[PDB]
Amino acid sequence: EILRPISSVVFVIAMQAEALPLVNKFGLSETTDSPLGKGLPWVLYHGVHKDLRINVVCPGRDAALGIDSVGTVPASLITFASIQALKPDIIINAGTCGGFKVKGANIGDVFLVSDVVFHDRRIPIPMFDLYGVGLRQAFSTPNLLKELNLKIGRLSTGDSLDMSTQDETLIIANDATLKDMEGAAVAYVADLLKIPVVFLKAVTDLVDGDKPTAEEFLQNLTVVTAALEGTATKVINFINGRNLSDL
Amino acid sequence: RPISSVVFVIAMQAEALPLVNKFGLSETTDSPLGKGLPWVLYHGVHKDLRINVVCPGRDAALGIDSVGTVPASLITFASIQALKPDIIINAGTCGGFKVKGANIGDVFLVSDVVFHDRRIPIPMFDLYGVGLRQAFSTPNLLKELNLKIGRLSTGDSLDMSTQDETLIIANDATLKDMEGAAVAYVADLLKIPVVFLKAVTDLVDGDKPTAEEFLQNLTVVTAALEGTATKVINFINGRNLSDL
């Protein structure tokens, strides 16, 4: 004890383009010293909204190839470094991802994740199977679900962007509404270091749906990311002034 | 200047203990890498060398070794930042391809390493998923110790799916594991030389269920890895990295 209102939050956002609209919305500033470590491509944005200190961290540009460092491994590293450096009350994993129409997802929905699994850590023996799947619960946010009326679902994570039949088999068996490339690894780290974790997952495509029309994916990313920033804004405002138990 | 500090990244307790005892390393009690994690760290000094062996520990929920890429990558990062080693050695058991010349008991050096389960069908993201990285070059060690060498392919599953095989075959891997490529990824971020000792416990092309063979060979093959790790430690002592 004694429990009190949430003071600081970190967002773990894999794609630096998914983070920018949140950074502008809040007048967050790219830190020029290097909190998380010297000589890393990781990007940190810092600011204060009202009663909330806000951190947004991105794994940044891959040195070899010039792209965002996607996947479970860079996401887990940055979750770990930013927790020890920054000491957040709560972690929010925000990002765009895939969705299943048969599970009720629609392009541009922003989901609040109920719980998360992996689909690509297959260790087919007793007790290593469960560990491989790595089922973790997102921190419970009944009031915020009531105010925002966001759709809810299980998220299933793997480091592959396509979907093999092996992935599909397990994503089906496990009832996932969503498929991304980071979340369950963020959930792992958060669990190790006992920090509440929330997920805001914006659906850009329907794994089990039709390919987008000409104009559709032309607009699609921009429109779905704006939808994601808009929901992230409302989460922050809601959180502001509240205790973890009041969430 | 001479190499003064080496860190072993070892995924499983059972792989680690033989080396712990051989060098009389002591279990770290102060949790330097972070309050409250399951990570295990043994410390010592051999001659000129500081020795540290870091393991991801028993899963808090399930009570078994915290295997796979994420734990590996976490402990590699955290131990590099805490200890500032000159070099990292990833040591462990793995599967080998018999048609590639691997045999049960063999302790391979590793030339370079790729991922087989990170498939991103976007230009430039494809090469990133694969994550081809070169092991630090140790020609004299290879020569003197007379070690087998080959490419290692990494992914988070113990079994092999069809598209797993496809990439393992395309990347001409001799060896299949669950950590190496991730360790290399991190060592690269932090510019630390990494080498790999990979001891073959099971033949992926062979006539046996993987985990039945894996577990049937483990006690003996882990003695074999200690055998090589010892010699590797003795060789490194007093040398520069360019001497390796």
CSV table of all heavy atoms in Angstrom, one decimal, chain A residues 41-42 62 65 67 69-70 72-74 76-77 80 84 120-122 125 127-128 131 159-162 164 167 188 193, chain B residues 33 37 39 59 62 64 66-67 70-71 73-74 77 117-119 122 124-125 127-128 156-159 161 164 189 211:
chain,number,residue,atom,x,y,z
A,41,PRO,N,18.5,1.5,-31.8
A,41,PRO,CA,17.7,2.2,-32.7
A,41,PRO,C,16.3,2.5,-32.2
A,41,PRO,O,15.5,3.1,-32.8
A,41,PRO,CB,17.6,1.2,-33.9
A,41,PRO,CG,17.5,-0.1,-33.1
A,41,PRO,CD,18.5,0.0,-32.0
A,42,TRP,N,16.1,2.1,-30.9
A,42,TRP,CA,14.8,2.3,-30.2
A,42,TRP,C,14.4,3.8,-30.1
A,42,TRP,O,15.3,4.6,-29.8
A,42,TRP,CB,14.8,1.6,-28.8
A,42,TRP,CG,15.2,0.2,-28.9
A,42,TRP,CD1,15.2,-0.7,-29.9
A,42,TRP,CD2,15.6,-0.6,-27.7
A,42,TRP,NE1,15.6,-1.9,-29.6
A,42,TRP,CE2,15.9,-1.9,-28.2
A,42,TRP,CE3,15.8,-0.4,-26.4
A,42,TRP,CZ2,16.3,-3.0,-27.4
A,42,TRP,CZ3,16.2,-1.4,-25.5
A,42,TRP,CH2,16.4,-2.7,-26.1
A,62,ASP,N,15.6,-1.1,-38.5
A,62,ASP,CA,16.6,-2.1,-38.5
A,62,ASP,C,17.8,-1.6,-39.3
A,62,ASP,O,17.6,-1.0,-40.4
A,62,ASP,CB,16.0,-3.4,-39.2
A,62,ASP,CG,17.0,-4.6,-39.2
A,62,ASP,OD1,17.4,-5.0,-38.1
A,62,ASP,OD2,17.5,-5.1,-40.2
A,65,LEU,N,18.4,-3.4,-42.9
A,65,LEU,CA,17.3,-3.4,-43.9
A,65,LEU,C,16.5,-2.1,-44.0
A,65,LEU,O,15.7,-2.0,-45.0
A,65,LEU,CB,16.5,-4.6,-43.9
A,65,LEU,CG,17.2,-5.9,-44.3
A,65,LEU,CD1,16.7,-7.1,-43.5
A,65,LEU,CD2,17.1,-6.2,-45.8
A,67,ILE,N,13.8,-0.9,-42.1
A,67,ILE,CA,12.4,-1.0,-41.8
A,67,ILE,C,12.2,-1.0,-40.3
A,67,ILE,O,13.1,-1.0,-39.5
A,67,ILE,CB,11.9,-2.3,-42.4
A,67,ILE,CG1,12.7,-3.5,-42.0
A,67,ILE,CG2,11.8,-2.3,-44.0
A,67,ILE,CD1,12.1,-4.8,-42.1
A,69,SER,N,11.5,-2.6,-36.8
A,69,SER,CA,11.9,-3.9,-36.3
A,69,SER,C,10.8,-4.6,-35.6
A,69,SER,O,10.6,-4.7,-34.4
A,69,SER,CB,13.1,-3.6,-35.3
A,69,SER,OG,14.2,-2.9,-35.9
A,70,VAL,N,9.9,-5.2,-36.5
A,70,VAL,CA,8.7,-5.9,-36.1
A,70,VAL,C,9.1,-7.3,-35.5
A,70,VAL,O,10.2,-7.7,-35.5
A,70,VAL,CB,7.7,-6.1,-37.3
A,70,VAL,CG1,7.2,-4.7,-37.7
A,70,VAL,CG2,8.3,-6.8,-38.5
A,72,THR,N,8.3,-10.5,-32.3
A,72,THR,CA,8.1,-10.6,-30.8
A,72,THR,C,9.4,-10.3,-30.1
A,72,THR,O,9.3,-9.8,-29.0
A,72,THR,CB,7.8,-12.1,-30.4
A,72,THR,OG1,8.9,-12.9,-30.8
A,72,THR,CG2,6.5,-12.6,-31.1
A,73,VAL,N,10.5,-10.5,-30.8
A,73,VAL,CA,11.8,-10.3,-30.1
A,73,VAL,C,12.2,-8.8,-29.8
A,73,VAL,O,12.4,-8.5,-28.7
A,73,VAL,CB,12.9,-11.1,-30.7
A,73,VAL,CG1,14.3,-10.5,-30.5
A,73,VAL,CG2,12.9,-12.6,-30.1
A,74,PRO,N,12.2,-7.9,-30.9
A,74,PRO,CA,12.4,-6.5,-30.6
A,74,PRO,C,11.3,-5.9,-29.6
A,74,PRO,O,11.7,-5.0,-28.8
A,74,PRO,CB,12.2,-5.8,-32.0
A,74,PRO,CG,12.7,-6.9,-32.9
A,74,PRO,CD,12.0,-8.2,-32.3
A,76,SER,N,9.7,-7.4,-27.2
A,76,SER,CA,9.9,-7.9,-25.8
A,76,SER,C,11.1,-7.2,-25.2
A,76,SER,O,11.1,-6.8,-24.1
A,76,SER,CB,10.1,-9.5,-25.8
A,76,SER,OG,11.3,-9.9,-26.4
A,77,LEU,N,12.1,-6.9,-26.0
A,77,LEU,CA,13.3,-6.2,-25.6
A,77,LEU,C,12.9,-4.8,-25.1
A,77,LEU,O,13.3,-4.4,-24.0
A,77,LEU,CB,14.3,-6.1,-26.7
A,77,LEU,CG,15.1,-7.4,-27.0
A,77,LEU,CD1,15.9,-7.2,-28.3
A,77,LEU,CD2,16.0,-7.8,-25.8
A,80,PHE,N,10.8,-4.6,-21.9
A,80,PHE,CA,11.7,-4.8,-20.7
A,80,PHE,C,12.6,-3.6,-20.4
A,80,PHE,O,12.7,-3.2,-19.2
A,80,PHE,CB,12.7,-6.0,-21.1
A,80,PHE,CG,13.6,-6.4,-20.0
A,80,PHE,CD1,13.2,-7.2,-18.9
A,80,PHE,CD2,14.9,-5.9,-20.0
A,80,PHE,CE1,14.0,-7.5,-17.9
A,80,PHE,CE2,15.8,-6.2,-18.9
A,80,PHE,CZ,15.4,-7.0,-17.9
A,84,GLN,N,12.0,-1.1,-16.8
A,84,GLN,CA,13.1,-0.9,-15.8
A,84,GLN,C,13.5,0.6,-15.9
A,84,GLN,O,13.8,1.2,-14.8
A,84,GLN,CB,14.3,-1.7,-16.1
A,84,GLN,CG,14.1,-3.2,-16.1
A,84,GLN,CD,15.3,-4.0,-16.0
A,84,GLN,OE1,16.3,-3.9,-16.8
A,84,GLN,NE2,15.4,-4.9,-14.9
A,120,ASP,N,2.8,-20.0,-32.7
A,120,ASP,CA,4.0,-20.5,-33.4
A,120,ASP,C,5.0,-20.9,-32.4
A,120,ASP,O,6.2,-21.0,-32.8
A,120,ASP,CB,4.5,-19.4,-34.4
A,120,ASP,CG,5.1,-18.2,-33.8
A,120,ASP,OD1,4.9,-18.0,-32.6
A,120,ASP,OD2,5.8,-17.5,-34.5
A,121,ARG,N,4.7,-21.1,-31.2
A,121,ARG,CA,5.6,-21.7,-30.3
A,121,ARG,C,5.1,-23.1,-30.0
A,121,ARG,O,4.5,-23.4,-28.9
A,121,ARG,CB,5.9,-20.9,-29.1
A,121,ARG,CG,6.1,-19.4,-29.3
A,121,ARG,CD,6.8,-18.8,-28.2
A,121,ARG,NE,6.1,-19.0,-26.9
A,121,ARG,CZ,6.5,-18.5,-25.7
A,121,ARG,NH1,7.6,-17.7,-25.7
A,121,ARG,NH2,5.8,-18.7,-24.6
A,122,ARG,N,5.2,-24.0,-30.9
A,122,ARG,CA,4.7,-25.4,-30.8
A,122,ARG,C,5.6,-26.4,-30.2
A,122,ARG,O,6.6,-26.8,-30.8
A,122,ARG,CB,4.3,-25.9,-32.2
A,122,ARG,CG,3.2,-25.2,-33.0
A,122,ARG,CD,3.1,-25.9,-34.4
A,122,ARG,NE,4.3,-26.3,-35.1
A,122,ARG,CZ,5.1,-25.5,-35.9
A,122,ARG,NH1,4.6,-24.3,-36.3
A,122,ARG,NH2,6.2,-26.0,-36.3
A,125,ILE,N,4.9,-31.5,-26.2
A,125,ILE,CA,5.0,-32.4,-25.1
A,125,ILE,C,4.4,-31.8,-23.8
A,125,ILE,O,4.2,-30.6,-23.7
A,125,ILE,CB,6.5,-32.7,-24.8
A,125,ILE,CG1,7.3,-31.5,-24.9
A,125,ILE,CG2,7.0,-33.9,-25.6
A,125,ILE,CD1,8.7,-31.8,-25.3
A,127,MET,N,3.3,-30.1,-20.5
A,127,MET,CA,3.8,-28.9,-19.8
A,127,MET,C,4.7,-27.9,-20.6
A,127,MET,O,4.9,-26.7,-20.1
A,127,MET,CB,4.6,-29.2,-18.6
A,127,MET,CG,3.8,-30.0,-17.5
A,127,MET,SD,2.3,-29.2,-16.9
A,127,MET,CE,3.0,-28.0,-15.8
A,128,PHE,N,5.2,-28.3,-21.7
A,128,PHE,CA,6.0,-27.4,-22.6
A,128,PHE,C,5.0,-26.9,-23.6
A,128,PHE,O,5.2,-25.8,-24.1
A,128,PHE,CB,7.2,-28.1,-23.3
A,128,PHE,CG,8.4,-28.2,-22.5
A,128,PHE,CD1,8.7,-29.3,-21.7
A,128,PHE,CD2,9.4,-27.1,-22.4
A,128,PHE,CE1,9.8,-29.5,-21.0
A,128,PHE,CE2,10.5,-27.3,-21.6
A,128,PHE,CZ,10.7,-28.4,-20.9
A,131,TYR,N,3.3,-23.9,-22.0
A,131,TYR,CA,4.3,-22.8,-21.9
A,131,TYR,C,4.4,-22.2,-23.3
A,131,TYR,O,4.6,-20.9,-23.4
A,131,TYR,CB,5.6,-23.4,-21.5
A,131,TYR,CG,6.8,-22.4,-21.7
A,131,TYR,CD1,7.0,-21.3,-20.8
A,131,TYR,CD2,7.6,-22.4,-22.8
A,131,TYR,CE1,8.0,-20.3,-21.1
A,131,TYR,CE2,8.6,-21.5,-23.1
A,131,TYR,CZ,8.8,-20.4,-22.2
A,131,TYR,OH,9.8,-19.5,-22.5
A,159,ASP,N,5.4,-14.7,-35.3
A,159,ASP,CA,6.4,-13.8,-36.0
A,159,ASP,C,6.2,-13.8,-37.5
A,159,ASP,O,7.0,-13.2,-38.2
A,159,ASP,CB,7.8,-14.2,-35.7
A,159,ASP,CG,8.3,-13.7,-34.3
A,159,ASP,OD1,8.6,-12.4,-34.2
A,159,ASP,OD2,8.3,-14.5,-33.4
A,160,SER,N,5.3,-14.6,-38.0
A,160,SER,CA,4.9,-14.6,-39.4
A,160,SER,C,3.7,-13.8,-39.7
A,160,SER,O,2.7,-13.9,-39.0
A,160,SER,CB,4.6,-16.1,-39.9
A,160,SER,OG,5.9,-16.8,-40.1
A,161,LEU,N,3.9,-13.0,-40.8
A,161,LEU,CA,2.8,-12.2,-41.2
A,161,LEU,C,1.8,-12.9,-42.1
A,161,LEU,O,0.6,-12.6,-42.1
A,161,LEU,CB,3.4,-11.0,-42.0
A,161,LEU,CG,2.3,-10.1,-42.7
A,161,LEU,CD1,1.4,-9.4,-41.7
A,161,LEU,CD2,3.0,-9.1,-43.7
A,162,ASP,N,2.2,-13.9,-42.9
A,162,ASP,CA,1.2,-14.7,-43.6
A,162,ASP,C,0.6,-15.6,-42.6
A,162,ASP,O,0.8,-15.5,-41.4
A,162,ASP,CB,1.8,-15.4,-44.8
A,162,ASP,CG,2.9,-16.4,-44.4
A,162,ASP,OD1,3.2,-16.5,-43.2
A,162,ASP,OD2,3.5,-17.0,-45.3
A,164,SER,N,0.2,-19.8,-42.3
A,164,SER,CA,0.3,-21.2,-42.8
A,164,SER,C,-1.0,-22.0,-42.3
A,164,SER,O,-1.7,-21.6,-41.5
A,164,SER,CB,1.5,-21.9,-42.3
A,164,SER,OG,1.5,-22.0,-40.9
A,167,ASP,N,-0.3,-22.5,-38.5
A,167,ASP,CA,-0.9,-21.4,-37.8
A,167,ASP,C,-2.4,-21.4,-37.7
A,167,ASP,O,-2.9,-21.2,-36.6
A,167,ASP,CB,-0.4,-20.1,-38.4
A,167,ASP,CG,1.1,-20.1,-38.6
A,167,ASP,OD1,1.8,-20.7,-37.8
A,167,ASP,OD2,1.5,-19.4,-39.6
A,188,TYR,N,4.1,-11.4,-22.1
A,188,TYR,CA,5.1,-12.2,-21.3
A,188,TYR,C,6.0,-11.3,-20.5
A,188,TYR,O,6.2,-11.5,-19.3
A,188,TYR,CB,6.0,-13.0,-22.3
A,188,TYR,CG,7.0,-13.8,-21.6
A,188,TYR,CD1,6.6,-15.0,-20.9
A,188,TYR,CD2,8.4,-13.5,-21.6
A,188,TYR,CE1,7.6,-15.8,-20.2
A,188,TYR,CE2,9.3,-14.2,-20.9
A,188,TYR,CZ,8.9,-15.4,-20.3
A,188,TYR,OH,9.9,-16.1,-19.7
A,193,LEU,N,7.6,-8.8,-15.0
A,193,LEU,CA,7.9,-7.6,-14.2
A,193,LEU,C,6.7,-7.0,-13.5
A,193,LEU,O,6.7,-5.9,-13.0
A,193,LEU,CB,8.6,-6.6,-15.2
A,193,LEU,CG,10.0,-6.8,-15.6
A,193,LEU,CD1,10.3,-5.9,-16.8
A,193,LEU,CD2,11.0,-6.5,-14.5
B,33,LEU,N,20.0,-8.7,-12.5
B,33,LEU,CA,19.3,-8.4,-13.8
B,33,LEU,C,17.9,-7.8,-13.6
B,33,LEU,O,17.3,-7.2,-14.5
B,33,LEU,CB,19.3,-9.6,-14.7
B,33,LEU,CG,20.6,-10.3,-15.0
B,33,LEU,CD1,20.5,-11.5,-15.8
B,33,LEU,CD2,21.6,-9.3,-15.5
B,37,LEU,N,12.5,-11.9,-11.2
B,37,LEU,CA,12.5,-12.7,-12.5
B,37,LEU,C,13.0,-14.1,-12.1
B,37,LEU,O,13.6,-14.4,-11.1
B,37,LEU,CB,13.4,-12.1,-13.5
B,37,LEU,CG,13.3,-10.6,-13.7
B,37,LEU,CD1,14.5,-10.1,-14.4
B,37,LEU,CD2,12.1,-10.1,-14.5
B,39,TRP,N,15.2,-15.7,-13.9
B,39,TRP,CA,16.5,-15.9,-14.5
B,39,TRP,C,17.6,-16.4,-13.5
B,39,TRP,O,17.7,-16.0,-12.4
B,39,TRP,CB,16.9,-14.6,-15.1
B,39,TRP,CG,16.0,-14.1,-16.2
B,39,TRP,CD1,14.9,-14.8,-16.7
B,39,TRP,CD2,15.9,-12.8,-16.8
B,39,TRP,NE1,14.2,-14.1,-17.6
B,39,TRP,CE2,14.9,-12.8,-17.7
B,39,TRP,CE3,16.7,-11.7,-16.7
B,39,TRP,CZ2,14.5,-11.7,-18.5
B,39,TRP,CZ3,16.4,-10.6,-17.5
B,39,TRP,CH2,15.3,-10.6,-18.4
B,59,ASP,N,9.8,-21.4,-15.6
B,59,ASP,CA,8.6,-20.7,-15.8
B,59,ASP,C,7.8,-20.6,-14.5
B,59,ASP,O,7.5,-21.6,-13.9
B,59,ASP,CB,7.7,-21.3,-16.9
B,59,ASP,CG,6.4,-20.5,-17.2
B,59,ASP,OD1,6.5,-19.4,-17.8
B,59,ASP,OD2,5.3,-21.1,-17.0
B,62,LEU,N,4.4,-22.6,-15.0
B,62,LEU,CA,4.4,-24.0,-15.4
B,62,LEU,C,5.6,-24.9,-14.9
B,62,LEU,O,5.5,-26.1,-14.9
B,62,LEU,CB,4.3,-24.1,-16.9
B,62,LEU,CG,2.9,-23.8,-17.4
B,62,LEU,CD1,2.9,-23.1,-18.7
B,62,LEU,CD2,2.0,-25.1,-17.4
B,64,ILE,N,8.9,-25.3,-15.8
B,64,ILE,CA,9.9,-25.8,-16.7
B,64,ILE,C,10.7,-24.7,-17.4
B,64,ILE,O,10.4,-23.5,-17.2
B,64,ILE,CB,9.2,-26.7,-17.8
B,64,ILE,CG1,7.9,-26.1,-18.3
B,64,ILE,CG2,9.0,-28.2,-17.2
B,64,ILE,CD1,8.0,-25.3,-19.6
B,66,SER,N,12.4,-22.0,-19.3
B,66,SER,CA,11.8,-21.0,-20.2
B,66,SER,C,12.5,-20.8,-21.5
B,66,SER,O,13.2,-19.8,-21.8
B,66,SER,CB,11.6,-19.7,-19.4
B,66,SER,OG,10.8,-19.8,-18.3
B,67,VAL,N,12.2,-21.8,-22.4
B,67,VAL,CA,12.9,-21.9,-23.7
B,67,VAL,C,12.3,-20.9,-24.7
B,67,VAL,O,11.4,-20.2,-24.5
B,67,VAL,CB,12.7,-23.4,-24.2
B,67,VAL,CG1,13.3,-24.4,-23.1
B,67,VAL,CG2,11.2,-23.7,-24.4
B,70,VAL,N,12.3,-15.4,-27.1
B,70,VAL,CA,12.0,-14.3,-26.3
B,70,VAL,C,12.8,-14.3,-24.9
B,70,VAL,O,13.6,-13.4,-24.6
B,70,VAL,CB,10.5,-14.0,-26.1
B,70,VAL,CG1,10.2,-12.9,-24.9
B,70,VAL,CG2,9.9,-13.6,-27.4
B,71,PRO,N,12.6,-15.4,-24.1
B,71,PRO,CA,13.5,-15.5,-23.0
B,71,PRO,C,15.1,-15.4,-23.3
B,71,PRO,O,15.7,-14.5,-22.8
B,71,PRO,CB,13.2,-16.9,-22.4
B,71,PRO,CG,11.8,-17.1,-22.8
B,71,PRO,CD,11.7,-16.5,-24.2
B,73,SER,N,16.5,-13.9,-25.7
B,73,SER,CA,16.8,-12.6,-26.2
B,73,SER,C,16.8,-11.6,-25.0
B,73,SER,O,17.7,-10.7,-25.0
B,73,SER,CB,15.9,-12.2,-27.4
B,73,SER,OG,14.9,-11.2,-26.9
B,74,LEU,N,15.9,-11.8,-24.1
B,74,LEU,CA,15.9,-11.1,-22.8
B,74,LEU,C,17.2,-11.2,-22.0
B,74,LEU,O,17.8,-10.2,-21.6
B,74,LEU,CB,14.7,-11.4,-22.0
B,74,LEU,CG,13.3,-10.9,-22.6
B,74,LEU,CD1,12.1,-11.4,-21.8
B,74,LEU,CD2,13.3,-9.4,-22.7
B,77,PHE,N,20.4,-9.7,-23.6
B,77,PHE,CA,20.4,-8.3,-23.5
B,77,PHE,C,20.7,-7.8,-22.1
B,77,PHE,O,21.6,-6.9,-21.9
B,77,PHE,CB,19.0,-7.7,-23.9
B,77,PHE,CG,18.8,-6.2,-23.6
B,77,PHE,CD1,19.3,-5.3,-24.5
B,77,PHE,CD2,18.2,-5.8,-22.4
B,77,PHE,CE1,19.1,-3.9,-24.2
B,77,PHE,CE2,18.1,-4.4,-22.1
B,77,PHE,CZ,18.5,-3.5,-23.0
B,117,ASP,N,11.0,-19.5,-38.8
B,117,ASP,CA,9.6,-19.2,-38.5
B,117,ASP,C,9.3,-17.7,-38.5
B,117,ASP,O,8.4,-17.3,-37.7
B,117,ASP,CB,9.2,-19.9,-37.2
B,117,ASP,CG,9.9,-19.1,-36.0
B,117,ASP,OD1,10.8,-18.3,-36.2
B,117,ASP,OD2,9.4,-19.3,-34.9
B,118,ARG,N,10.0,-16.9,-39.2
B,118,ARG,CA,9.6,-15.5,-39.3
B,118,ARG,C,9.4,-15.1,-40.7
B,118,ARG,O,10.3,-14.5,-41.4
B,118,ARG,CB,10.6,-14.6,-38.6
B,118,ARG,CG,11.1,-15.1,-37.1
B,118,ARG,CD,11.7,-13.9,-36.3
B,118,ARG,NE,12.6,-13.1,-37.1
B,118,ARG,CZ,13.2,-12.0,-36.7
B,118,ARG,NH1,12.9,-11.6,-35.5
B,118,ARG,NH2,14.0,-11.4,-37.5
B,119,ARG,N,8.2,-15.4,-41.3
B,119,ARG,CA,7.9,-15.2,-42.7
B,119,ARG,C,7.1,-14.0,-42.9
B,119,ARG,O,6.0,-13.9,-42.6
B,119,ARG,CB,7.1,-16.4,-43.2
B,119,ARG,CG,7.6,-17.8,-42.8
B,119,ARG,CD,6.7,-18.9,-43.3
B,119,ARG,NE,5.4,-18.6,-42.8
B,119,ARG,CZ,4.7,-19.2,-41.9
B,119,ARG,NH1,5.2,-20.3,-41.3
B,119,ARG,NH2,3.5,-18.8,-41.5
B,122,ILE,N,7.0,-9.3,-47.5
B,122,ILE,CA,7.1,-7.9,-48.0
B,122,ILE,C,8.6,-7.8,-48.3
B,122,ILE,O,9.4,-8.3,-47.6
B,122,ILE,CB,6.7,-6.9,-46.9
B,122,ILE,CG1,5.3,-7.1,-46.5
B,122,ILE,CG2,7.0,-5.4,-47.3
B,122,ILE,CD1,4.8,-6.3,-45.3
B,124,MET,N,12.3,-6.6,-48.3
B,124,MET,CA,13.1,-6.2,-47.2
B,124,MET,C,12.7,-6.6,-45.8
B,124,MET,O,13.5,-6.5,-44.9
B,124,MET,CB,13.1,-4.6,-47.1
B,124,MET,CG,13.3,-3.8,-48.5
B,124,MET,SD,14.7,-4.4,-49.5
B,124,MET,CE,16.1,-4.3,-48.4
B,125,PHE,N,11.5,-7.2,-45.7
B,125,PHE,CA,11.0,-7.6,-44.5
B,125,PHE,C,11.2,-9.1,-44.5
B,125,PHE,O,11.5,-9.7,-43.4
B,125,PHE,CB,9.5,-7.5,-44.3
B,125,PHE,CG,9.0,-6.2,-43.7
B,125,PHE,CD1,8.7,-5.1,-44.5
B,125,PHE,CD2,9.0,-6.0,-42.3
B,125,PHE,CE1,8.3,-3.9,-43.9
B,125,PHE,CE2,8.6,-4.8,-41.7
B,125,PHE,CZ,8.2,-3.8,-42.5
B,127,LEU,N,13.9,-10.6,-45.7
B,127,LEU,CA,15.3,-10.8,-45.3
B,127,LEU,C,15.5,-10.5,-43.8
B,127,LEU,O,16.3,-11.2,-43.2
B,127,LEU,CB,16.3,-9.8,-46.1
B,127,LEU,CG,16.3,-10.1,-47.6
B,127,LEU,CD1,17.1,-9.0,-48.3
B,127,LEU,CD2,17.0,-11.5,-47.9
B,128,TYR,N,14.7,-9.6,-43.3
B,128,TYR,CA,14.7,-9.3,-41.9
B,128,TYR,C,14.2,-10.5,-41.0
B,128,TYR,O,14.8,-10.9,-40.0
B,128,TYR,CB,13.9,-8.0,-41.7
B,128,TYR,CG,13.6,-7.7,-40.2
B,128,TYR,CD1,14.5,-7.1,-39.4
B,128,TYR,CD2,12.4,-8.1,-39.7
B,128,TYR,CE1,14.2,-6.9,-38.0
B,128,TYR,CE2,12.1,-7.9,-38.3
B,128,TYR,CZ,13.0,-7.3,-37.5
B,128,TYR,OH,12.7,-7.0,-36.2
B,156,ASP,N,10.7,-21.1,-32.8
B,156,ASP,CA,10.2,-21.3,-31.5
B,156,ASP,C,9.5,-22.7,-31.3
B,156,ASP,O,8.9,-22.9,-30.2
B,156,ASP,CB,9.3,-20.2,-31.0
B,156,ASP,CG,10.1,-19.0,-30.5
B,156,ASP,OD1,10.6,-19.1,-29.4
B,156,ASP,OD2,10.1,-18.1,-31.3
B,157,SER,N,9.5,-23.5,-32.3
B,157,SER,CA,8.8,-24.8,-32.2
B,157,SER,C,9.9,-25.9,-32.2
B,157,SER,O,11.0,-25.8,-32.7
B,157,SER,CB,7.8,-25.0,-33.3
B,157,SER,OG,6.7,-24.1,-33.2
B,158,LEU,N,9.5,-27.1,-31.5
B,158,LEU,CA,10.4,-28.2,-31.4
B,158,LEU,C,10.1,-29.1,-32.6
B,158,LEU,O,11.0,-29.8,-33.1
B,158,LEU,CB,10.1,-28.9,-30.1
B,158,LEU,CG,10.8,-30.3,-29.7
B,158,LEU,CD1,12.3,-30.0,-29.7
B,158,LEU,CD2,10.3,-30.8,-28.4
B,159,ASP,N,8.8,-29.1,-33.0
B,159,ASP,CA,8.5,-29.9,-34.2
B,159,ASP,C,8.9,-29.1,-35.5
B,159,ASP,O,9.5,-28.0,-35.4
B,159,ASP,CB,7.0,-30.2,-34.2
B,159,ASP,CG,6.1,-29.0,-34.5
B,159,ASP,OD1,6.5,-27.8,-34.5
B,159,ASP,OD2,4.9,-29.2,-34.7
B,161,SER,N,7.1,-27.8,-39.1
B,161,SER,CA,6.1,-27.7,-40.0
B,161,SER,C,6.6,-27.7,-41.4
B,161,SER,O,7.9,-27.5,-41.6
B,161,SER,CB,5.2,-26.4,-39.8
B,161,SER,OG,5.8,-25.2,-40.3
B,164,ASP,N,8.4,-24.6,-42.4
B,164,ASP,CA,9.6,-24.6,-41.6
B,164,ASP,C,10.7,-25.3,-42.4
B,164,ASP,O,11.8,-24.7,-42.6
B,164,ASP,CB,9.4,-25.3,-40.2
B,164,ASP,CG,8.6,-24.5,-39.2
B,164,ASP,OD1,8.4,-23.2,-39.5
B,164,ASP,OD2,8.2,-25.0,-38.2
B,189,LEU,N,22.9,-6.1,-32.0
B,189,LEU,CA,22.4,-4.8,-31.6
B,189,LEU,C,23.4,-4.1,-30.7
B,189,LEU,O,23.6,-2.9,-30.7
B,189,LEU,CB,21.0,-4.9,-30.8
B,189,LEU,CG,19.7,-4.6,-31.4
B,189,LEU,CD1,18.6,-4.4,-30.3
B,189,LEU,CD2,19.7,-3.4,-32.3
B,211,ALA,N,11.1,-35.6,-29.6
B,211,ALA,CA,11.2,-35.5,-28.1
B,211,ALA,C,11.5,-36.8,-27.4
B,211,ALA,O,12.1,-36.7,-26.3
B,211,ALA,CB,9.9,-34.9,-27.6
